[PDB]
Amino acid sequence: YLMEGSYNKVFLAKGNIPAESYTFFIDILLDTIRDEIAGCIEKAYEKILFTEATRILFFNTPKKMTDYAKKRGWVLGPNNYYSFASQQQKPEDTTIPSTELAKQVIEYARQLEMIV
Amino acid sequence: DLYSRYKKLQQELEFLEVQEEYIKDEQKNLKK
Amino acid sequence: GIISLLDEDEPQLKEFALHKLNAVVNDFWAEISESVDKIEVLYEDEGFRSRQFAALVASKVFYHLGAFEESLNYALGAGDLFNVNDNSEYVETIIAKCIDHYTKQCVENADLPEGEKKPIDQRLEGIVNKMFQRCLDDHKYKQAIGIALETRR
Amino acid sequence: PKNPDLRIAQLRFLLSLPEHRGDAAVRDELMAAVRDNNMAPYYEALCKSLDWQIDVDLLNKMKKANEDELKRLDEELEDAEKNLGESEIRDAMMAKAEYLCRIGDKEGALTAFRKTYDKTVALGHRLDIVFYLLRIGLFYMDNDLITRNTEKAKSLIEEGGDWDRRNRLKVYQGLYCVAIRDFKQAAELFLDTVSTFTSYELMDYKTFVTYTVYVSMIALERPDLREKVIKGAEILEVLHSLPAVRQYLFSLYECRYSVFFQSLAVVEQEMKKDWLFAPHYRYYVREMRIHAYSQLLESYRSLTLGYMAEAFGVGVEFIDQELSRFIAAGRLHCKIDKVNEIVETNRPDSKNWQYQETIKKGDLLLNRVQKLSRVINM
Amino acid sequence: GLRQYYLSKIEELQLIVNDKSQNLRRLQAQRNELNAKVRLLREELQLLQEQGSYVGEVVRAMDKKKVLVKVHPEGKFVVDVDKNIDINDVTPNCRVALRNDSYTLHKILPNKVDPLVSLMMVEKVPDSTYEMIGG
Amino acid sequence: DDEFEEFPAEDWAGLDEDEDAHVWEDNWDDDNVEDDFSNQLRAELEKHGY
Amino acid sequence: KTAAAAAEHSQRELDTVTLEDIKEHVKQLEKAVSGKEPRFVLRALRMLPSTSRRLNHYVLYKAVQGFFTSNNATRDFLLPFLEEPMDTEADLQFRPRTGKAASTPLLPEVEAYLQLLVVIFMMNSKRYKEAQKISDDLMQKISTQNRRALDLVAAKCYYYHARVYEFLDKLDVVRSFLHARLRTATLRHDADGQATLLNLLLRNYLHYSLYDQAEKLVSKSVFPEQANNNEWARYLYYTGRIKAIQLEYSEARRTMTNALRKAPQHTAVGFKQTVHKLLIVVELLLGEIPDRLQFRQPSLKRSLMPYFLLTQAVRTGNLAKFNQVLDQFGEKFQADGTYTLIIRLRHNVIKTGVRMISLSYSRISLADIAQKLQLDSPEDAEFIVAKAIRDGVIEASINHEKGYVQSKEMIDIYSTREPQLAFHQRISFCLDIHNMSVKAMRFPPKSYNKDLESAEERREREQQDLEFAKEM
């Protein structure tokens, strides 16, 4: 379930444990789930109101997200949350590729002329 | 006896490395 | 995984496991290969009761990791505890290296023997001689002469 | 030139491969087996369905007939050596081979034909010997034998014109390329021999046109059809006698897609039964569907699959289901938007495919060269 | 004794010597071919100056290992035969060579076209078989 | 040669009647395990009432 | 007794030929020691498996009496192990060693070979307890000696020794034996024997679930470059499976495929199926579709069927087919010790489907995604679709409020730099093989330089005569 995105089952299993409460570990998973869920939603999506993210996992209307938003981004606006991802300024460059490419071709020349 | 062999071969190995530089040095000159 | 008990801060309990490792330092040494270097940490520890038996295990583990330089370094740490049973198929592997290291050290010293020479470790020097006497006590003289020349002594 | 009767193969295929065809072939097939004294093929003939317990009496008198004939040629062989010879001796061995080839297993025939090849000093007859090797090879789909004598025949045709033989060779080679899933070669070869069909021994002309039209559309592009099978004088006349096939070809060009599928279904069921096409009957139906989809999508840019669900055969979910599988396959350039129920076309340049395959072609060759290296030097 | 530090180093050197020696012969055999090639091409200039050899036809063998040959546009000659060539091979009309001035058979060149075949080349009766026979 | 007997050799039990004996450019698109094409089309007209 | 007479002819013909064969082999071992180079030893050893099943009790009986002419302890204990042939009227004096040779003690090499035979024949005899005892004697002796040629033969004796315990189902007992042997193999020796040991010591780890400590040995121990091209096949397979179970798929596929091509073609058909089976499973987890050629081979048709049906469900994005394929053939996955790797494919069945679904559609309703992928619900579809975006499975983003997954038009791939990267991989290796090809080119030349064109005396004599006449 963790390997794929299926998480609604994880909380369903969180309430069904074979040995005992096992809460000494489920608390550990909380760190490995919420951090992942926030990261996924961090992509270049549009505004998401504080109504889906609030009542989604287990809680109705807590203050955790307020802290959650504070340590993450999600700039606060007119009930407007943004998640912008460009990854476009960095790409589209060959000067750095130029040095890598120059080494590459020289190796072709190196291993084409000199005797090994 | 044995010292006559450990140090006798030591010369041989340090010899075969000299013929590896002369043979591979004439190749660069013979080809020219 | 018996080496698991090496962190309870119990000086007597820790050493009991170290005793067991040597007997099982060949069948399943691999687990204690690099994930457990605490043998050296305890070998520097002031707790005593150790620093010579850990070296026995510490050098044995490094024996087959190949780093004979590390194996030689810790092997001398056991001093009289290590090479006492000079009759075996393991003593010869390190001793063959002790002579190997000494000869590479003695020669480098001969270039500048008039002071400012490297401080040859006393414990290593004794080991080679102890091996050297074992040659003489064995009466075999041909080998004895050469090792003298190689050692430059 | 019917001794290696190809029709027998069709009856065998219809009897063996289709598990639901075991009713009518029982009549025609048996008569041919008994007639002409076929015995070796009979031995494997009963090995497909079952023992056919009541069969020994019928062939009890038939087996003895073979023995007398073979000894008759053997006796004649001694006379041939001790008589005119040259031409007489060559015909004697050829006579033996023809019966052996027409009767049963190759091994006697293949060894017999090879023996007579050396003694034949006329290039024209050498082609006759080789052409036989194609017929029996095509009978049993012996790729190793067929793939060899085809080059042998081509080499012989170079010396001396023998254009009639060359035209004959094209049909025989064409049949091979259609048994194998290489339709492109068959269309080029068959279309050249449409106006020259002297090989009535297999696939009488009426069927030859259907084969030429069944593979022409899967092989060539629309501009090529305009002057090869549509405006072609030879092919248009034959179709007048065939109502089903004619509506199949002109449906694609006339863009009456609804009748296309109904015509493509009948060709679907007919191809399974027909020998030499069943192995890739599934491929033909699927490939023709893609060829039809791309034809319609090429013109427009933003047609709605609701419009396709009627002008390309009933069903809105079928076109959705069918289209989705083909886009993932990498063909049928188009990309579907479900919520608005619209399919928008795209124009991938003719380099991505060209590069995508030059690496896939290169990999196949590259693997081959790697395996050669390990074969040598342990 | 010490035959474990002393018979161990000796063996280690033995392995490190065999492989290097193995690699060496593979390296000096390569050079030997290159040295020969330079030598061959250096002697060609001194070789492509010895006078060429006449080409003649031996009408009939004679006795005492001597043959009578007719040279190209020139008169007949009775010439001795080099010992490398057996007189038995020297047959009626065929093509031979003479040295440059001390004429002596060198090699039995490729055989000349048979005179009859020339007749079949001037006259060109087309080849035919029973197959292209009609009626 | 130096064959490995430690790994068991599974029984062949193959069909030695030359079931296919064909060399093509076989890809993975030939085995979608669909029920022909006529059947799907045949039920299509009746399913939609046409 | 007519039937017995017919069997006598076949038996007598076989034993006589092989017995002469063993004599030919033994001379080779003596030749190898005589020449002081161990290469000849492989010549007899290579045929050893071929002649393994060509020996009878009669064959061995003479060998023990034949080669070991000296009154050694062998006759004291070797005879009881092997049934003695009955008194035969047609008896001949078979003494491979004559005079001083018979009296002179047999060399360790010939001693190792012969003892290696008795155990081998016993193995075919199904007698194990006896084989282990004899194996211990043969194995104990070869450890004491330190001959250089004995290492080659010892390697084989090393392997068959473990096999003896295999039928003995001991394994654990022999593990310490190899570990100690590899201990001496690396230092005391330097090669050609630890290759066989490493596979054996590696094998015992795999036979149990001892993967955790298996990966430790690979990371630390190295392998010889001269592995005879036969031991290397096993090393790749086992190392392939070790990385396979630990999510190191990328190198798992490359390690096996290298083992595949280095594996024997004509024989070793048994392990070809096992190597193939794991590779197709490792590829499926990676995502690349395995080739269809090797699902049609004569020797792979039946074996791969339980795995061919698996690839049918994995290639198709639908998840129900994979589940319906697991329950059908789960047992055979248990039987082959590979089911552990299959239960982890459920993620891939979704990744492939989501890849194709996002590849073929542009704006598909969130609910519709579940139906095509048999997700069983739309609420969880978002996360996996959302999660699939992070790893790079698909590119385009999603509209949380509207509820449709959108796809970006990824076209014009040629301009990007990836095609150059793909060409570098092919270029680098293709230029590699040519360098290797020249590597074997400089070996063939051997004593092929002294070749006079025509002659020497003839040319010199003729030139001198011409020069004298030229002047006058």
From Swiss-Prot, chain A:
Domain of life of the native organism: Eukaryota
Native species: Homo sapiens
Family: Belongs to the proteasome subunit S14 family.
Gene designation: PSMD8
Crosslink feature (Glycyl lysine isopeptide (Lys-Gly) (interchain with G-Cter in SUMO2)) location: 63
Record function comment: Component of the 26S proteasome, a multiprotein complex involved in the ATP-dependent degradation of ubiquitinated proteins. This complex plays a key role in the maintenance of protein homeostasis by removing misfolded or damaged proteins, which could impair cellular functions, and by removing proteins whose functions are no longer required. Therefore, the proteasome participates in numerous cellular processes, including cell cycle progression, apoptosis, or DNA damage repair.
Subunit structure: Component of the 19S proteasome regulatory particle complex. The 26S proteasome consists of a 20S core particle (CP) and two 19S regulatory subunits (RP). The regulatory particle is made of a lid composed of 9 subunits including PSMD8, a base containing 6 ATPases and few additional components. Interacts with DDI2. Interacts with TASOR.
Record's protein name: 26S proteasome non-ATPase regulatory subunit 8
UniProtKB/Swiss-Prot annotation, chain C:
Domain of life where this protein originates: Eukaryota
Signal sequence interval, chain numbering: none
Subunit-structure text: Component of the 19S proteasome regulatory particle complex. The 26S proteasome consists of a 20S core particle (CP) and two 19S regulatory subunits (RP). The regulatory particle is made of a lid composed of 9 subunits, a base containing 6 ATPases and few additional components including PSMD1. Interacts with ADRM1. Interacts with ZFAND1.
Stated role: Component of the 26S proteasome, a multiprotein complex involved in the ATP-dependent degradation of ubiquitinated proteins. This complex plays a key role in the maintenance of protein homeostasis by removing misfolded or damaged proteins, which could impair cellular functions, and by removing proteins whose functions are no longer required. Therefore, the proteasome participates in numerous cellular processes, including cell cycle progression, apoptosis, or DNA damage repair.
Family, as annotated: Belongs to the proteasome subunit S1 family.
Protein name as catalogued: 26S proteasome non-ATPase regulatory subunit 1
Species whose genome carries this gene: Homo sapiens (Human)
Gene: PSMD1
UniProtKB/Swiss-Prot annotation, chain E:
Subcellular location: Cytoplasm; Nucleus
Superkingdom of source: Eukaryota
SS bond list: none
Coiled-coil segments: none
Residues recorded with modification Phosphoserine: 102
Assembly and oligomerization: Component of the 19S proteasome regulatory particle complex. The 26S proteasome consists of a 20S core particle (CP) and two 19S regulatory subunits (RP). The regulatory particle is made of a lid composed of 9 subunits, a base containing 6 ATPases including PSMC5 and few additional components. Component of a complex with USP49 and RUVBL1. Interacts with PRPF19. Interacts with TRIM5. Interacts with NDC80. Interacts with PAAF1. Interacts, in vitro, with the thyroid hormone receptor (in a thyroid hormone T3-dependent manner) and with retinoid X receptor (RXR). Interacts with ERCC6.
The family this protein is said to belong to: Belongs to the AAA ATPase family.
Primary role: Component of the 26S proteasome, a multiprotein complex involved in the ATP-dependent degradation of ubiquitinated proteins. This complex plays a key role in the maintenance of protein homeostasis by removing misfolded or damaged proteins, which could impair cellular functions, and by removing proteins whose functions are no longer required. Therefore, the proteasome participates in numerous cellular processes, including cell cycle progression, apoptosis, or DNA damage repair.
Protein name as catalogued: 26S proteasome regulatory subunit 8
The species this protein was found in: Homo sapiens
UniProtKB/Swiss-Prot annotation, chain F:
Physiological role: Component of the 26S proteasome, a multiprotein complex involved in the ATP-dependent degradation of ubiquitinated proteins. This complex plays a key role in the maintenance of protein homeostasis by removing misfolded or damaged proteins, which could impair cellular functions, and by removing proteins whose functions are no longer required. Therefore, the proteasome participates in numerous cellular processes, including cell cycle progression, apoptosis, or DNA damage repair.
Subunit structure: Component of the 19S proteasome regulatory particle complex. The 26S proteasome consists of a 20S core particle (CP) and two 19S regulatory subunits (RP). The regulatory particle is made of a lid composed of 9 subunits including SEM1, a base containing 6 ATPases and few additional components. Belongs to the TREX-2 complex (transcription and export complex 2), composed of at least ENY2, GANP, PCID2, SEM1, and either centrin CETN2 or CETN3. Component of the homologous recombination repair (HR) complex composed of ERCC5/XPG, BRCA2, PALB2, DSS1 and RAD51. Interacts with the C-terminal of BRCA2.
Species of origin: Homo sapiens
Annotated localization: Nucleus
GO cellular component: cytosol; integrator complex; nucleoplasm; proteasome complex; proteasome regulatory particle, lid subcomplex; protein-containing complex
Chief location bin: nucleus
